[PDB]
């Protein structure tokens, strides 16, 4: 039903037939980014829960697949699996802990 990601449709009657008006979702403006499958942090590998790791040259964020929305990489949106010696392309970056400023204060 249409080209792109389908959202709705509407039927219209026609002589000896039917007419559909498919409403779709088409992405428009694209930008290159530097990506990585995992992040090495304290001897642990962090994979994104929903989304993809990207970088703007200096810092590293996590971003959903179909839209650009960078977020600070914490332990809420990542999960740990294994070590850093088995994944090809794992980079070195820190992962924020939300409990540390609450424990310090």
């Amino acid at each position: 039903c249409g080209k792109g990601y389908h959202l709705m449709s509407f039927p219209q009657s026609a002589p000896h037939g039917v007419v559909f008006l498919h409403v779709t979702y088409v992405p428009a403006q694209e930008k290159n980014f530097t990506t990585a499958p995992a992040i090495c942090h304290d001897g642990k590998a962090h994979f994104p829960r929903e989304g993809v790791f990207v970088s703007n040259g200096t810092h590293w964020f996590v971003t959903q697949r179909n839209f650009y929305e960078p977020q600070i990489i914490t332990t809420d949106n990542t999960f740990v699996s294994g070590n850093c010696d088995v994944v090809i392309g794992i980079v070195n970056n820190t992962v924020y802990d939300p409990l540390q400023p609450e424990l310090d204060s």
């Binding site: 792109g4 995992a38 993809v52």
Partner: protein, 99 residues
């Protein structure tokens, strides 16, 4: 000396028209669909092609079938070897049996 049936069909008024798309233009479409799938995934079927590494879009496709993506990244070489052996077996099956 040995006359074929094509000349009998030919002289009795039964002709065969050639296709509009030759076999070279079908292979160009097939090559475009192959190079769009490998280098972009399913993003060239919706809008414009968005590049993504292959070892990452296969981790996108284990997430569709219900497997977490660490299974790919911890077993990438095994899956690559299995796919290469499967393509070799497809070659052997197509070059051995004509049925």
């Amino acid at each position: 000396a040995a006359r074929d049936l094509i000349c009998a069909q030919k002289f009795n008024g039964l002709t065969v028209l050639p296709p509009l798309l030759t076999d070279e233009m079908i292979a160009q479409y097939t090559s475009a669909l192959l190079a769009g799938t490998i280098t972009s995934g399913w993003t060239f079927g919706a809008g414009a092609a968005l590049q993504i590494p292959f070892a990452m879009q296969m981790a996108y496709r284990f997430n569709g079938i219900g497997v977490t993506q660490n299974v790919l990244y911890e077993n990438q070489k095994l899956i690559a070897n299995q796919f290469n052996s499967a393509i070799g077996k497809i070659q052997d099956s197509l070059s051995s049996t004509a049925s």
